[PDB]
Amino acid sequence: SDTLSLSLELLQQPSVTPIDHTCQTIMADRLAKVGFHIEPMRFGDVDNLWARRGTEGPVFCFAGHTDVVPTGRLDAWNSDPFAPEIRDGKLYGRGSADMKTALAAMVVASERFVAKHPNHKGSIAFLITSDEEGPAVNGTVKVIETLEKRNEKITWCLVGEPSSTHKLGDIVKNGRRGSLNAVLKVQGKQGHVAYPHLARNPIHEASPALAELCQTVWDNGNEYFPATSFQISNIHAGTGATNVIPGALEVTFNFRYSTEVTAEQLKQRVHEILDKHGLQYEIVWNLSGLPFLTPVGELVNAAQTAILNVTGTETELSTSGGTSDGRFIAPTGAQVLELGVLNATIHQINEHVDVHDLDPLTDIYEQILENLLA
Amino acid sequence: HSDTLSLSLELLQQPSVTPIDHTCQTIMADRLAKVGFHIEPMRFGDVDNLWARRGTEGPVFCFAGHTDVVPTGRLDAWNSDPFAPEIRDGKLYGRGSADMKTALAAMVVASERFVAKHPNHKGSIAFLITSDEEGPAVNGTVKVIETLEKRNEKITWCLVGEPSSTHKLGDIVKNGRRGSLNAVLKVQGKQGHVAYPHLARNPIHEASPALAELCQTVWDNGNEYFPATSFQISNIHAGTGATNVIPGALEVTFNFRYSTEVTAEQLKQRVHEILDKHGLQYEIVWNLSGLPFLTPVGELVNAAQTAILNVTGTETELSTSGGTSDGRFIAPTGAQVLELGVLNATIHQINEHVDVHDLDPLTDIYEQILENLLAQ
Numbered sequence: 001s002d003t004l005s006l007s008l009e010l011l012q013q014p015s016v017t018p019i020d021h022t023c024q025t026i027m028a029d030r031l032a033k034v035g036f037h038i039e040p041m042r043f044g045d046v047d048n049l050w051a052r053r054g055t056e057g058p059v060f061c062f063a064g065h066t067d068v069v070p071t072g073r074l075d076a077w078n079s080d081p082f083a084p085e086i087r088d089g090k091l092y093g094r095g096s097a098d099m100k101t102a103l104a105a106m107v108v109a110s111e112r113f114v115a116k117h118p119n120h121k122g123s124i125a126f127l128i129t130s131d132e133e134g135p136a137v138n139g140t141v142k143v144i145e146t147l148e149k150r151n152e153k154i155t156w157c158l159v160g161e162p163s164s165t166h167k168l169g170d171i172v173k174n175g176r177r178g179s180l181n182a183v184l185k186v187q188g189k190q191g192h193v194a195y196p197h198l199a200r201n202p203i204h205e206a207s208p209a210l211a212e213l214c215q216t217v218w219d220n221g222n223e224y225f226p227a228t229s230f231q232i233s234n235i236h237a238g239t240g241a242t243n244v245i246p247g248a249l250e251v252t253f254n255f256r257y258s259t260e261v262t263a264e265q266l267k268q269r270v271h272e273i274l275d276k277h278g279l280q281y282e283i284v285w286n287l288s289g290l291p292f293l294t295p296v297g298e299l300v301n302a303a304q305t306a307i308l309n310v311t312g313t314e315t316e317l318s319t320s321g322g323t324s325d326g327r328f329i330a331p332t333g334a335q336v337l338e339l340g341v342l343n344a345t346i347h348q349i350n351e352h353v354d355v356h357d358l359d360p361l362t363d364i365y366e367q368i369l370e371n372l373l374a
Numbered sequence: 375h376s377d378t379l380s381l382s383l384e385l386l387q388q389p390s391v392t393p394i395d396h397t398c399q400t401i402m403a404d405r406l407a408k409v410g411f412h413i414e415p416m417r418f419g420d421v422d423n424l425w426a427r428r429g430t431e432g433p434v435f436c437f438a439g440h441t442d443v444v445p446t447g448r449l450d451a452w453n454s455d456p457f458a459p460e461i462r463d464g465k466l467y468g469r470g471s472a473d474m475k476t477a478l479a480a481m482v483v484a485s486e487r488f489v490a491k492h493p494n495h496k497g498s499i500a501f502l503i504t505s506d507e508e509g510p511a512v513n514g515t516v517k518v519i520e521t522l523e524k525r526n527e528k529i530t531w532c533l534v535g536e537p538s539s540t541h542k543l544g545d546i547v548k549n550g551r552r553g554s555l556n557a558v559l560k561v562q563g564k565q566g567h568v569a570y571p572h573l574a575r576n577p578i579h580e581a582s583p584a585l586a587e588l589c590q591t592v593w594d595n596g597n598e599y600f601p602a603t604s605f606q607i608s609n610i611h612a613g614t615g616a617t618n619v620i621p622g623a624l625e626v627t628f629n630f631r632y633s634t635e636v637t638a639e640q641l642k643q644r645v646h647e648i649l650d651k652h653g654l655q656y657e658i659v660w661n662l663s664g665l666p667f668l669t670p671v672g673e674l675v676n677a678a679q680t681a682i683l684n685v686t687g688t689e690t691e692l693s694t695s696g697g698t699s700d701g702r703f704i705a706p707t708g709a710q711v712l713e714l715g716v717l718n719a720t721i722h723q724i725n726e727h728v729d730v731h732d733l734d735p736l737t738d739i740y741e742q743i744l745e746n747l748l749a750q
């Protein structure tokens with residue numbers, strides 16, 4: 001499996017956002033040998049790659065990221081997350097599902113495709129970033145900004161995110177809910193634990209609020225998007241002393257919202273709940289991504305037939321899960337479709353992917369090239 | 375100008391964050407040694423301790439206290455360096471300025487004056503000082519007492535210099551304290567993607583309602599001797615910093631200051647009862663810092679009431695409120711215990727400070743306590 005060997009090379013590079021750690025170079029060196037122009041695009045602390053074979057339309061673009069989320073408790077892993085290994089037909093390692101394996105399949109499919117169909121029409125392109133998981137202010141958004149400024153349009157973009165639920169290709173995504181982040185800093189007053197009346201415990205004041213937020217029903221979603229969901233990712237207060245009341249509480253949370261609400265409606269409803277609990281705080285909001293929905297067209301069609309032909313599965317469209325760089329690509333007018341491995345273990349400890357899906361996914365991606373460009 | 379202020383500054387300049395003594399006990403010993411106190415340093419683990427004693431016969435009066443201070447943190451919220459003591463509009467600012475280096479200084483100066491005035495005093499005077507009172511406190515005063523007890527060296531009266539006062543100097547003295555039970559609760563979740571919560575277990579979400587209940591729970595109503603049991607969460611942590619990752623675990627550090635209406639095992643049983651109710655998967659590591667204690671009202675209280683009234687015109691009042699102290703380790707021996715010090719208004723806070731006008735009076739009080747117990 002050429003996909004497996006390339007997967008391992010990428011998986012061995014520790015690439016926690018926004019580190020690339022040679023990943024885009026490894027890819028570029030492959031692509032450069034099969035007629036792709038290599039155009040790296042550094043933006044601050046982020047590395048990006050625009051690779052393109054052909055100068056005429058239509059333009060098919062494979063999108064993805066080389067960065068991975070933090071590993072977590074290193075002693076909770078059964079094997080080093082940056083030392084990939086197979087164990088009972090399962091490939092373990094951070095990025096094994098989200099999404100270094102897809103990256104590899106896109107490259108091998110591209111190579112195999114160019115070999116059997118060298119005089120194909122249109123162009124094939126790769127838009128790869130090293131900051132998709134984080135702020136994403138210097139990633140794919142800046143690449144698009146550059147492409148748009150020189151009128152370089154993408155017709156079809158297939159983001160190799162892990163779209164599947166139960167079996168490979170059972171789900172493909174043409175849209176996504178929005179993503180709204182917040183860092184809440186609740187102010188109290190540092191003091192002695194045995195003299196709470198002379199202090200303000202932020203953990204105590206915020207408790208009822210966090211409890212309320214966690215149970216609050218935001219919307220019921222709609223026929224295109226699941227309901228808005230609330231999640232607290234981080235919470236911190238205190239430095240260690242058991243007899244000291246902390247002066248502040250930091251709470252980091254996020255909304256994945258449907259088109260039934262706007263970032264502004266959510267913000268206002270959240271301040272309204274914090275005000276209701278008589279809190280003294282400050283929030284720093286950040287709109288990570290807008291809800292988006294691209295049209296169902298030939299990319300969806302090419303993918304329905306490729307999936308059915310490789311796996312015998314009837315795929316189903318969805319906007320579920322997280323979001324992707326498709327939010328920065330969709331505004332250009334390209335049809336966006338996400339297709340990858342199972343998302344069962346993404347961002348989890350002992351993240352893995354079934355080896356039996358690597359070659360199929362590679363084949364699926366190859367056949368999509370054939371249906372759209374030959 | 376004040377000898378008490380002067381020594382206060384000297385002690386204050388030493389960054390003695392639990393359990394680093396940073397020469398404080400040496401500063402104190404060098405002075406006590408010049409007025410007949412034998413100096414017996416007792417280092418246990420990484421904790422320094424001082425048993426200083428003048429005399430070999432009873433009764434035995436003991437000044438107790440700690441040189442360690444709670445952490446400062448480079449918060450920048452400090453108007454002046456916490457280990458660079460200074461005065462502003464008659465207030466001495468610095469970490470430990472109230473808890474409790476000013477008292478240490480006052481005890482030493484009172485001892486020096488008492489000895490100069492009454493060289494032929496009866497009984498003995500001793501200082502039992504530790505560098506770990508604010509922390510785990512396993513290698514501190516508890517060990518000194520283990521040592522004294524094993525060689526039948528008994529303390530009659532023990533005056534702890536913790537900041538006992540509420541509004542004005544010596545308005546409150548404490549002969550007892552509530553217990554102190556600590557816990558580090560680790561709620562076990564399952565790390566994952568925030569947008570795929572059904573495939574994970576957010577421990578912050580699960581614990582949220584349980585914590586909320588713990589904060590609103592009525593543990594007891596206390597009694598005529600002790601205020602009601604209080605619960606406080608001191609620290610809470612989950613997640614590395616990523617916004618799209620559900621953390622695998624939540625760590626919650628909390629404490630109970632409890633009355634004699636409940637026992638540590640009763641509290642422990644209700645907490646698990648409440649956590650299990652919310653269907654949490656967790657482990658708790660408990661640590662009993664101190665048992666509730668109440669010593670008898672005797673000669674020491676009488677000497678303190680008199681001393682205080684004569685110095686400030688204030689009638690002190692008994693109490694077991696606030697936190698706890700090393701009296702919890704001295705009380706089991708039979709010593710009458712009484713805590714008397716400066717205001718506790720700013721202890722464990724940023725910009726901790728003490729009203730300078732209380733230093734000389736506190737010193738006079740200590741000296742008079744000595745006079746009322748060991749002179750006539």
Ligand SMILES: [Zn+2]
Nearest residue numbers: 065098099161
């Ligand atoms: Zn991804």
Ligand SMILES: [Zn+2]
Nearest residue numbers: 069098133346
């Ligand atoms: Zn991800």
Ligand SMILES: [Zn+2]
Nearest residue numbers: 440473474536
């Ligand atoms: Zn103290």
Ligand SMILES: [Zn+2]
Nearest residue numbers: 444473508721
């Ligand atoms: Zn203290």
